[PDB]
């Protein structure tokens, strides 16, 4: 209700501890806080958790109470609803460990809770479903900054992180800062009066841009006609998909050339009718750099097909033969399939349609009766539409794993190069045989926070 003042007391925070690697950490917690006046679910609360030291006057690994960091990580996974977590937390799904090893690093973190595609409110109306997620992201960042210096930690040093639809869900919160779009769904929940811009991007496998991945998809899986993808689950192309495969691949050397992206020294970046062109050698040399690293620590770079080793050097890259290897993991469409049976159909559904289509292919070749979700929310939740109305964060970090099929190589990639090309600082990389997976590379990624921050 309106009683909820949405003021954050330190006097909530109590301690505790965790044994971690050999060490017990020290940290206070306060959990459950409501963060909007107007929940409209019971999973919007958020959980804040604080380095003991910090409470005692004391510093941790160059911080303190006034300028740490804040890690705003979300437990979103395939757009369902995302648990506050907790680094006591043990039930699927969780980062415990991320938040366990961001408290020794000296970060607060404000893990919130969010509503995903299945949430249903009181009466059991779906309530969760676009842009419900990052609109509750946005409320708990604004419910921090609004608690700046209540709350421990520097609110202008938020920092989201995420994987795949949580990946996505950081990179937006990122890159919409303060967009007009939000207001009246976050003055509709009585969110805290103050800016949703944060300081920098953390993103795992960002399952974004998703009215174009179809066709990012086919042109990286056309020709492997195989599928592999919980129950182990396989199939075979049909006529029909192979035919959306290939038109799928053909347009999206159209998308990706009106884009206008350049290279380091300032060539546009494009395909060719067949998909072939400096914008694929981009993605190629990505790999390639991604084997080298492996391979100078001694790894067998030869599980995946395709690599050209010279001396003690990768020097190119047989881009079909790896993705063969590789291995296909979805069908055709894989983001907005006809039948509408996918997570994104889902998330772009509401309390009327469980789901929707959201490309004009899709919806002209339905299977079943659909209608196509508003075009303005579905430019909404694309990062890349806030770089091409918004504040946006100055640094990213953004991976994808090169033995990652849930989306195309392209995807990211395209992320990264407007961010570059826009001049924001963008850490990327595909680490090598990395699966769908997160929050791997915690010594990389702390070190590239205290980078920006210390
Ligand atoms: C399965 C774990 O990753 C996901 O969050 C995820 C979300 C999506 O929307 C996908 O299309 C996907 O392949 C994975």
Same mark, same amino acid.
């Given at each position: 209700?309106?009683?909820?003042?949405? $003021?954050?007391?330190?006097?909530?925070?109590?301690? &505790?501890?965790?044994?971690?690697?050999?060490?017990?950490?020290?940290?206070?917690?306060?959990?459950?806080?409501?963060?909007?006046?107007?929940?409209?679910?019971?999973?919007?609360?958020? #959980?804040?958790?604080?380095?003991?030291?910090?409470?005692?006057?004391?510093?941790?690994?160059? %911080?303190?109470?006034?300028?740490?960091?804040?890690?705003?990580?979300?437990?979103?996974?395939?757009?369902?609803?995302?648990?506050?977590? !907790?680094?006591?937390?043990?039930?699927?799904?969780?980062?415990?460990?991320?938040? *366990?090893?961001?408290?020794?690093?000296?970060?607060?973190?404000?893990?919130?809770?969010?509503?995903?595609?299945?949430?249903?409110?009181?009466?059991?109306?779906?309530?969760?479903?676009?842009?419900?997620?990052?609109?509750?992201?946005?409320?708990?960042?604004?419910?921090?900054?609004?608690?700046?210096?209540?709350?421990?930690?520097?609110?202008?040093?938020?920092?989201?992180?995420? =994987?795949?639809?949580?990946?996505? =869900?950081?990179?937006?919160?990122?890159?919409?800062?303060?967009?007009?779009?939000?207001?009246?769904?976050?003055?509709?929940?009585?969110?805290?009066?103050?800016?949703?811009?944060? @300081?920098?991007?953390?993103?795992?496998?960002? $399952?974004?841009?998703?009215?174009?991945? !179809?066709?990012?998809?086919?042109?990286?899986? #056309?020709?492997?006609?195989?599928?592999?993808?919980?129950?182990?689950?396989?199939?075979?192309?049909?006529? &029909?998909?192979?035919?959306?495969? +290939?038109?799928?691949?053909?347009?999206?050397?159209?998308?990706?050339?009106?884009?206008?992206?350049?290279?380091?020294?300032?060539?546009?970046?494009?395909?060719?009718?067949?998909?072939?062109?400096?914008?694929?050698?981009?993605?190629?040399?990505?790999? $390639?750099?991604?084997?080298?690293?492996?391979?100078?620590?001694?790894?067998?770079?030869?599980? %995946?097909?395709?690599?050209?080793? /010279?001396?003690?050097?990768? /020097?190119?890259?047989?881009?079909?033969? %790896?993705?063969?290897?590789?291995?296909?993991?979805?069908?055709?469409?894989?983001?907005?399939?006809?039948?509408?049976?996918?997570?994104?159909? #889902? +998330? @772009?559904?509401?309390?009327?349609?469980?789901?929707?289509?959201?490309?004009?292919?899709?919806?002209?070749?339905?299977?079943?009766?659909?209608?196509?979700?508003?075009?303005?929310?579905? *430019?909404?939740?694309?990062?890349?539409?806030?770089?091409?109305?918004?504040?946006?964060?100055?640094?990213?970090? $953004?991976?994808?794993?090169?033995?990652?099929?849930?989306?195309?190589?392209?995807?990211?990639?395209?992320?990264?190069?407007?961010? &570059?090309?826009?001049?924001?600082?963008?850490?990327?990389?595909?680490?090598?045989?990395?699966?769908?997976?997160?929050? %791997?590379?915690?010594?990389?990624? @702390?070190?590239?926070?205290?980078? +920006?921050?210390?």
């Amino acid at each position: 209700s309106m009683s909820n003042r949405l $003021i954050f007391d330190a006097d909530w925070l109590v301690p &505790e501890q965790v044994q971690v690697a050999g060490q017990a950490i020290q940290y206070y917690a306060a959990r459950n806080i409501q963060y909007v006046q107007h929940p409209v679910a019971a999973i919007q609360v958020l #959980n804040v958790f604080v380095p003991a030291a910090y409470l005692h006057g004391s510093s941790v690994n160059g %911080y303190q109470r006034a300028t740490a960091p804040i890690l705003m990580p979300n437990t979103v996974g395939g757009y369902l609803p995302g648990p506050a977590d !907790d680094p006591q937390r043990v039930t699927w799904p969780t980062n415990a460990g991320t938040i *366990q090893q961001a408290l020794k690093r000296g970060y607060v973190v404000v893990a919130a809770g969010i509503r995903g595609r299945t949430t249903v409110d009181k009466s059991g109306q779906r309530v969760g479903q676009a842009p419900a997620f990052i609109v509750d992201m946005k409320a708990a960042i604004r419910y921090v900054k609004y608690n700046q210096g209540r709350l421990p930690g520097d609110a202008n040093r938020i920092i989201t992180n995420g =994987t795949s639809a949580g990946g996505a =869900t950081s990179a937006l919160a990122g890159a919409s800062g303060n967009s007009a779009y939000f207001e009246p769904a976050l003055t509709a929940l009585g969110a805290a009066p103050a800016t949703d811009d944060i @300081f920098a991007v953390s993103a795992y496998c960002p $399952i974004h841009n998703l009215e174009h991945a !179809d066709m990012a998809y086919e042109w990286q899986f #056309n020709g492997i006609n195989d599928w592999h993808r919980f129950e182990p689950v396989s199939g075979q192309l049909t006529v &029909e998909e192979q035919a959306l495969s +290939l038109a799928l691949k053909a347009q999206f050397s159209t998308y990706l050339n009106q884009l206008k992206l350049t290279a380091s020294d300032g060539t546009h970046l494009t395909l060719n009718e067949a998909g072939m062109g400096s914008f694929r050698d981009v993605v190629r040399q990505l790999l $390639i750099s991604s084997a080298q690293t492996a391979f100078d620590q001694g790894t067998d770079i030869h599980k %995946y097909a395709g690599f050209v080793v /010279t001396g003690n050097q990768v /020097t190119d890259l047989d881009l079909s033969a %790896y993705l063969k290897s590789l291995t296909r993991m979805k069908a055709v469409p894989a983001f907005d399939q006809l039948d509408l049976t996918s997570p994104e159909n #889902n +998330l @772009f559904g509401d309390a009327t349609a469980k789901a929707k289509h959201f490309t004009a292919l899709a919806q002209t070749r339905s299977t079943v009766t659909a209608q196509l979700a508003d075009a303005e929310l579905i *430019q909404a939740i694309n990062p890349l539409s806030y770089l091409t109305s918004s504040q946006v964060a100055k640094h990213w970090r $953004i991976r994808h794993g090169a033995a990652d099929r849930d989306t195309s190589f392209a995807i990211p990639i395209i992320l990264a190069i407007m961010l &570059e090309n826009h001049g924001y600082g963008i850490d990327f990389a595909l680490p090598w045989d990395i699966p769908h997976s997160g929050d %791997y590379d915690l010594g990389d990624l @702390f070190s590239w926070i205290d980078g +920006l921050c210390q």
